[model samples]
Structure formats: C-alpha cells, structure tokens
Target: MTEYKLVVVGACGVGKSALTIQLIQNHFVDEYDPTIEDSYRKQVVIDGETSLLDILDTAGQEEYSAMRDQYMRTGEGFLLVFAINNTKSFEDIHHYREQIKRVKDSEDVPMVLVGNKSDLPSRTVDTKQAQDLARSYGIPFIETSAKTRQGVDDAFYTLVREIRKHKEK
Candidate 1:
C-alpha cells in the first residue's frame, strides 16, 4: 500500500478546491479563503490494490504560488483544473503546466486536465476544444461538477490509472 501525492492546480478563481473537497470530504467553498492550503487524503482500490491519493488543494495561487514549486518535486501526478465557465481558468493551465514542467523538470509527469463544473451554463471552454487541449498534453480531460458529483470519481480514478501507468515504465 502506497500513498502518492496528487497535486491540484489552477488559477485563483478556477474552483481548484472544488474538485479536491468533493473527492475528499467533498465543495464549492465560496468566499475568499485564498492562500490557505489544505491537504486531503483519500482511499481507493479501483485497480484492485488499496492505495492512497494525497491531494493538495489550492496549490497554484496566493501564498502557495512559489510554494507550488516545492509541491512539484513530490507530485507523482497532477490534476490540472479549471472552471468551464471561466475562460481564464482554462487559459491558466498553460502556466500551471509550465510550473510543473519547470519544477518537476520532466516532460513525462503524469497529469489530467479537468474542466470543473460541467453543470454551469456559462461554460466558455468548449468540449471538443478542451478535449483537444487535453489531447495536446497527452492527458485525459474530464469535466466535473461538485453539486451533482459528476465525473468526480472518474477524474480521480483516471489520475490513479495514469500514475499506475507511469509506474509501469
């Protein structure tokens, strides 16, 4: 039984915490509670063996800004998150990806592009486009919602699988 650190990152208002909270204690924490980082642990065994996924919510903004560089060293896999309704959220993934590549210093780091809040109608990031973006990263793209709990499990499991795949090499 191993516990891997799965880092979550995004812009300031991209609902980065939303996916982490729902996946853990489960979100949508409104308010300006930025800068405070929260680490949550989860238990999972989809590929059969029970393992752990330790998630760091809010890893890309505020005080954690440069601190995320520290997080990059240990992150076995990353959850690149963005709110679908917000355009900047999607755009910021480039910088976050850069941060991971910069600190992790590897082109093979496992990561998933997550488009959070599929339930929102104000969605600006198109589905095909998001898929293409994820495709460009050679990672899976999953759209999720904290309210209805859509794709939450899939996102985590897919990430776990990616890590598992990464390990096989």
Candidate 2:
C-alpha cells in the first residue's frame, strides 16, 4: 500500500482541523477551539487499501508558522483550506502556497484547494473564485462542509486521485 503524507493547512478558525476530522473519522466537533499546537497522523483505508494520511493539523496562529515549515518538509500533498464565509482565510491561501514552496521546493506539488464551511450561509467566497485560484496555482479545487458532510469525501478522494494520476504519468 502506498502511504501518502497529507498536510491540511489554513488560517486559524478556518476549519482545517474540522475538515480533517470529518474526512479521517467522519465526525465533526461543534465547538472546536483552535489552540491545537502539535501535528497529528492517521491511517485511512481507501478502495480497500490502507494508506497513511499524515494529517498535520496546525494552529492557525502566527506563532505556529514554524510548524508549517517543518510539516511541509514531509508532506506528499497538501489540502489548503479556507472558510467559505471568511474572505481573510481565502487570502491566506496565497501565503500558504509560498510557505509550501519554500519548504517543498516545487510549485508543482499536488494540492487541493479546499473551500470549507460549505454549510454556512452567506459565503464570502464562491466556487468561481476558488476554481480560478486553484487554476492559477495549477492545483485541484473543491468545496466542502464538515457540518453537512458535503463534499468532504471528494476533498480527500480528489487529492488521492490527483496523486495517483501524477504517479501514473
């Protein structure tokens, strides 16, 4: 079985951990706090094969920026997340890309631009913008909601598909 080191990144309170929890365990925490300081790892079985999905759920605070650099060194792919209702989080994706490049040394790294919090009303960012940003970065994009469990599977599954496609190529 192929093990993939997957990193989930975004600004604090942007639902990175929430989405990771939902994808890895199919569960959500209603009142999640963003004080988590260390990285986490979990194994996911997809299509009857066990793959290690190393989840680096970092604190979104500026103090945790070092962890981002450290985590990027070991990641095979990344899930760059942003809250659908938070435009600031959307803007932070650019910086996250820069950080990934600094650590991974390639812009071609497989990434899934995740527009999370899809269950929230009054979205600050839309699908078009998300699609455009992902295209600009040359990465896949998808919207997901940890609350309603909408697109959560697609978010990770799409990453897996992209990684496999790249490997095949």
Candidate 3:
C-alpha cells in the first residue's frame, strides 16, 4: 500500500486540529488547546485502492513558524484550513501557500483550501471569496463543520484524490 504524508495548516484557532481529530477519530472536540504538533496514521481506501495516510497536524502559532518549513518539506498534500468567522485566518492562506511553494520548490503542490466551522452562525469570510481564492491557486475549495460532520469527509477524500492524481502524473 502507498503512504501519503498530509499536513493540516492555518492560523491559530482555525480548527486545524479539530478537523484532523474529527477525520481520524470521528469526534468533535469543543475546547481549544493550541497544538505544538500531532501525528496520526490511518488506513484509507480511495478509488478501491487502500493506502496509509500519515497526517501531521501542525501548530498555527507564530512561534511555530520556523518549524513549518520542516513540516512543509515532508508533506505530499496539504489541507489549508481556516475558520469561516476569522478573516485573518483566511488571509493567512496566501502566506501558507507561498511557504509551501518555497519549501517544496514547486507551485504544483496538491492542496485543498478548507473553510472550517461552517456550523457557526456568524461568518466573516464569504464562500465566494474563498472560492475565488481557490480558483486563483488552482486548488479545490471546501467548507467543513467538525461539529456537524459536514463536508469533513469530502475535504480529505478530495485531497487524497488530488494526491493520487498528482502521483500518477
């Protein structure tokens, strides 16, 4: 079986860990504790092919910025997560993209731009804006709610497909 290293990244408190936990554990955590770094392994079947998924859930704090390059280097695919209510987190995706490109030395990286926390009533970032940004980056965009389990599977499944597609080429 193939193994893919996927990284989840975004600004602080944007639900990167929550989404990762939801995906791997099928549980939504309400409380927020900033992550330094966490790793998870799962076996997933995509398109009838079984593969091992190695997920690196990263810290979103500014102090962890130096460690991001190391994480970016090992990532085969990325889920760029942001909270719908936090515009700053949305804006930070550009920086994350640039960092990935710089570290990986390729703009053709497999990635998904994810707007998380869809269950929240007040949203500062509009769907159209996020979609436009994803279009600009030539990557798939998705919105997910860990609380409701909406779009969570689609986001990761789409990313795995992208990774497999890229590997095929």
The TM-scores of all predictions, comma-separated, are 0.90, 0.87, 0.94
lDDT of 2 by residue, 56-87 (tens): 77665575456557767888788899998999
Lowest-scoring 10 consecutive residues by lDDT in candidate 2? 59-68
- Clash count list over all predictions: 2, 0, 0
* Cα displacement (Å) at residue 28, model 1: 4.8
Runs in model 1 lying further than 4 Å from the true structure? 59-67
Clashing pairs in 3: none
Q: Which residue pairs collide, candidate 2?
A: none
Model 2 residue 119 CA deviation in Å: 1.3
Q: Indicate the TM-score of model 3.
A: 0.94
Candidate 1 lDDT over 123-149, as tens digits, reads 788999889998888999988886678
Model 2 alpha-carbon drift over 4 Å, by segment: 38-50, 63-68
Please report how far candidate 3 places residue 27 from its true position, in Å.
Answer: 0.9
TM-score: which candidate is best?
3
Question: In candidate 3, what residue range of length 10 has the lowest lDDT sum?
Answer: 59-68
lDDT of 3: 0.89
Say which prediction, candidate 2 or candidate 3, comes out ahead on lDDT. 3
For each candidate in the order shown, give its overall lDDT on alpha carbons: 0.81, 0.80, 0.89
Off by over 4 Å in 3: 64-67
